């Protein structure tokens, strides 16, 4: 069964780009991650920094997650992220996305042994 | 001297084809890619997606290489590859290959700075 730790890397990690490099990053990036498989996942954030630089956020500032649960942590440093949003107009099997490059702190939910990111909570 | 990745690119990149269109793709390719120069290489797989998308597996699912080395990576997406097997009848200077075509997940060894595919570990 795909694990929660691998799901996060599949949906949010991208260490080979320094940042989204063109307006098409999202449309392809999202599909290759199989995020358009059963339907337009509507919004998705990608991080272009090391898995370690990211797993390390799990030891950074502890913050309450948007769900009220307390396993979240916020990046001390800002990180290159690429934000991906379904456009009005985006429509399952033709899902379409606006790609925004940004540098901001991220919030991830952490769990298990290595302690690593299992859910992407938000960028600030 | 040919780089390990230029070599990877010569031994398995095949981006001009969606896939092998005949049982003779294999005999044709094995020879041109210089792999039958000193002996009949017995086994070898060609991948039919952009170099961009193979290099992209280098940020995909970390997996252990056949040798225990961990700089291997498994493709989130399945890919069309053509499998080439040395046939009985094949006799070095007359190498013959069985051509097998499928859509499967691939495993690459990655190395250096750009991080790129240098080794074909396996298809799943």
């Amino acid at each position: 069964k795909e694990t929660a730790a691998a799901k996060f890397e599949r949906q949010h990690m991208d260490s080979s780009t320094s940042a989204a490099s063109s307006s098409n990053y999202c449309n392809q990036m999202m599909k290759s991650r199989n995020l358009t498989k059963d339907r337009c996942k509507p919004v998705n954030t990608f991080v272009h920094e090391s898995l370690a630089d990211v797993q390390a956020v799990c030891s950074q500032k502890n913050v309450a997650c948007k769900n009220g649960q307390t396993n979240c942590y916020q990046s001390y440093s800002t990180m290159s992220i690429t934000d991906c949003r379904e456009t009005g107009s985006s429509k399952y099997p033709n899902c379409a996305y606006k790609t925004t490059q940004a540098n901001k702190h991220i919030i991830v939910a952490c769990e298990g042994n290595p302690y690593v990111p299992v859910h992407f909570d938000a960028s600030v």
Side-chain angles (χ1 to χ4, degrees), chain A residues 27-92:
Chain A
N27 285 287
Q28 2 125 345
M29 258 313 221
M30 285 271 304
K31 177 225 278 329
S32 110
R33 301 297 152 113
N34 284 8
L35 293 168
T36 119
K37 203 93 328 217
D38 326 303
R39 49 173 239 145
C40 301
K41 165 203 236 284
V43 182
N44 189 84
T45 304
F46 282 101
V47 183
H48 326 299
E49 303 257 325
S50 24
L51 179 48
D53 288 326
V54 190
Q55 315 205 287
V57 157
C58 290
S59 320
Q60 256 152 90
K61 165 166 282 117
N62 157 262
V63 327
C65 296
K66 117 189 84 98
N67 65 353
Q69 318 210 118
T70 213
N71 67 276
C72 284
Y73 295 79
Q74 130 192 351
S75 46
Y76 287 162
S77 258
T78 23
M79 320 194 168
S80 109
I81 43 140
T82 263
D83 218 70
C84 287
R85 184 45 139 321
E86 206 212 319
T87 223
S89 341
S90 167
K91 108 156 232 94
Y92 184 35

